[PDB]
């Protein structure tokens, strides 16, 4: 279960470089050391829970 292409109003798509979730303490996209800060995520759109 992932988000489809047509349904939601404001939401359209999330990329790879456009990620926001544990991307402060993790590297860029190479196994390189810390390069960023703590911020709320965008890619995994939830339906589980509230």
């Amino acid at each position: 279960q992932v988000v489809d292409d047509t349904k939601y109003k404001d939401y359209q798509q999330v990329g790879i470089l456009h990620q926001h979730n544990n991307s402060g303490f993790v590297g860029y996209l190479a196994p390189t050391m810390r390069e960023g800060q703590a911020y709320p995520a965008n890619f995994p759109y939830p339906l589980i829970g509230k």
């Binding site: 292409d5 047509t6 349904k7 109003k9 359209q12």
Partner: protein, 43 residues
Amino acid sequence: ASRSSARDDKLTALLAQLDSLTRELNVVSQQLLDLRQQVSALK
């Protein structure tokens, strides 16, 4: 010598266009749902 290559050129032309001719549609299914939310659910 050339006998079959002419059909493949119009095959690729009406595949790249056939699709584009689908991005036009792809972004209308969301465009029409965007305009109805507003008036159809409020007041």
